[PDB]
Amino acid sequence: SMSYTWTGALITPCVYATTSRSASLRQKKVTFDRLQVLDDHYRDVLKEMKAKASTVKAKLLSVEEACKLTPPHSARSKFGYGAKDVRNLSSKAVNHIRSVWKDLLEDTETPIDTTIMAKNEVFCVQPEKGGRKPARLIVFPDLGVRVCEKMALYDVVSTLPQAVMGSSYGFQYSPGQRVEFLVNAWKAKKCPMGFAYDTRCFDSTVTENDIRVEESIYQCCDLAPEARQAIRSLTERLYIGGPLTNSKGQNCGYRRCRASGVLTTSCGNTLTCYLKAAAACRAAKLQDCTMLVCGDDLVVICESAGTQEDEASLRAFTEAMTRYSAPPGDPPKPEYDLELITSCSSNVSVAHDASGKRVYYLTRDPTTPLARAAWETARHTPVNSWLGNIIMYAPTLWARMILMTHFFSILLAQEQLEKALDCQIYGACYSIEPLDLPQIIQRLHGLSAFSLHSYSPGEINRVASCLRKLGVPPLRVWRHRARSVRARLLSQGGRAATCGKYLFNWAVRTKLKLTPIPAASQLDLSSWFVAGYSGGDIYHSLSRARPRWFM
Numbered sequence: 001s002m003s004y005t006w007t008g009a010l011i012t013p014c015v016y017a018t019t020s021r022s023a024s025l026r027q028k029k030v031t032f033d034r035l036q037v038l039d040d041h042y043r044d045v046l047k048e049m050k051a052k053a054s055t056v057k058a059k060l061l062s063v064e065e066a067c068k069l070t071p072p073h074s075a076r077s078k079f080g081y082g083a084k085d086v087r088n089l090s091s092k093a094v095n096h097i098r099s100v101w102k103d104l105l106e107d108t109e110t111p112i113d114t115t116i117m118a119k120n121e122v123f124c125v126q127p128e129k130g131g132r133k134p135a136r137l138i139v140f141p142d143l144g145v146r147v148c149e150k151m152a153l154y155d156v157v158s159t160l161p162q163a164v165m166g167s168s169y170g171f172q173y174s175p176g177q178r179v180e181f182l183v184n185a186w187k188a189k190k191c192p193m194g195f196a197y198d199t200r201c202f203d204s205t206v207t208e209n210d211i212r213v214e215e216s217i218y219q220c221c222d223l224a225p226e227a228r229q230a231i232r233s234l235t236e237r238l239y240i241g242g243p244l245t246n247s248k249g250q251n252c253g254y255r256r257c258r259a260s261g262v263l264t265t266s267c268g269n270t271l272t273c274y275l276k277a278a279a280a281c282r283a284a285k286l287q288d289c290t291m292l293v294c295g296d297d298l299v300v301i302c303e304s305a306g307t308q309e310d311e312a313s314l315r316a317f318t319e320a321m322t323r324y325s326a327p328p329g330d331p332p333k334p335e336y337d338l339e340l341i342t343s344c345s346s347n348v349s350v351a352h353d354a355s356g357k358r359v360y361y362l363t364r365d366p367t368t369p370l371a372r373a374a375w376e377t378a379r380h381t382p383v384n385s386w387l388g389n390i391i392m393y394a395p396t397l398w399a400r401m402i403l404m405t406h407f408f409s410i411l412l413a414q415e416q417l418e419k420a421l422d423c424q425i426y427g428a429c430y431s432i433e434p435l436d437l438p439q440i441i442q443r444l445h446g447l448s449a450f451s452l453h454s455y456s457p458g459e460i461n462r463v464a465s466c467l468r469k470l471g472v473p474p475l476r477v478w479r480h481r482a483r484s485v486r487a488r489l490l491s492q493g494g495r496a497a498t499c500g501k502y503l504f505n506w507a508v509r510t511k512l513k514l515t516p517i518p519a520a521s522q523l524d525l526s527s528w529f530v531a532g533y534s535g536g537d538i539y540h541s542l543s544r545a546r547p548r549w550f551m
Ligand SMILES: O=C(O)/C=C/c1ccc(NC(=O)C2(NC(=O)c3ccc4c(C5CCCCC5)c5n(c4c3)CC(=O)Nc3ccccc3-5)CCCC2)cc1
Pocket: 015, 370, 371, 373, 374, 377, 402, 403, 406, 470, 471, 472, 473, 474, 477
């Protein structure tokens, strides 16, 4: 069937930023017919996946538990209540939610309505490698449906992918654990070969059968009868497809592929990508495969069979994925160095700690992170990508010297160090105070993230070249600025001094000892690197469970 059909009604609105203008160009690419042919490898992998799902027991979340998971700036319902009413458990919100739930149990076939919208993302043009990227599309149900999805499937999408995929499930890893996983997998091979597989419009490649196969994996869970019916009903009425409405309420057409803004998007895409990839590994006869999957993002680390043989197996893997309705964007290329693999926009690099020991870390080209931070400094934004990049890329040269220095000077000038800000980690929203950054960093990357040096020449040059192309002052200027930022932070004591001492120890002439932060243990990060929730509409506020009086 067609991934999408359109009426003609426009997708209306609600260093460039992506707009609803370019939505017409995106529609053309994501609109096609799917031809999927399944085989014995696919059927075998599926049965193996279902046997592991059979060990999962999932709980039905209460209305209150589901309401607490709703982000405060989550789109309001078309039925007279918003995200604040949901979080406060107002009678109107709760009554509406309970009737939407009852309707999921009684109606098994009527397609649920969704809103289509062009996502606004900040990119960096540079007319040296083509032109501007068209806006991505976001398809999501009403607020009431979104709360019901959490009641029925929040525990499923948080527990099941790990039980099914094991160590291949990428969202269970902090950046430090992701690093450790890839390094260990690379070292486990006699002669390693690795590749990244990029699918062309993954959401659009997802067929109705893929969505039903995904439900067959969920149905293997021990579930409450009502959860079981809600999964069945949500699959038919929402997940498989349904009508699309623009921001103006006009009928835009119809979808028969994956919706980007449903709770099961990340889980479903990870399960589908893993299933198709593991099956294709068998068709291509790749030896001792190690996969790492985050939605549509796949990395394969395997045993090399020779330069000509690896190229042949990669074309075979591609032919199999294409048959499964997952053709590539860019053709995959075999890499024989771990650093040469770019997965989830990131690559492995090495540095040294204070005692000269090797430390592997994840980094990426810093153009987009810096362009986005520049946009966010210029105008007020709901999500601060700068904060997420400080969190995820804390050991990197660019995040330490530029992002930490720039944003801590602004927070110092605005006296906003204690003000909690929202950031997105694995598709989920987190309300974090900048003053908690040293404890967060120690927990995800280790105490060494504050003492890293001996960066590679390639990494230094990439960062340096990037600062030049963007008009950012050189690294020597940042060192000077960090010294004042650090001095002012130290003078304030408490968590602010810890920000000075730990985040800016790289800037001082004579470096400090740096002992573990005692209050880092009491930080509750149990909901952090568990699962992916892209378009899932998930919120968590950071908690410091059991505080000592002297901390
Ligand atoms: O010794 C030498 O040889 C050269 C010395 C030298 C060169 C330039 C400066 N610049 C400045 O002082 C000013 N800008 C900055 O001190 C500045 C700070 C952050 C900047 C950023 C980002 C960096 C990441 C966090 C968010 C801010 C960008 N740009 C920045 C400029 C340059 C800019 O204006 N815009 C962009 C656009 C895209 C990407 C980055 C930028 C402030 C007043 C005048 C301009 C200072 C010293």
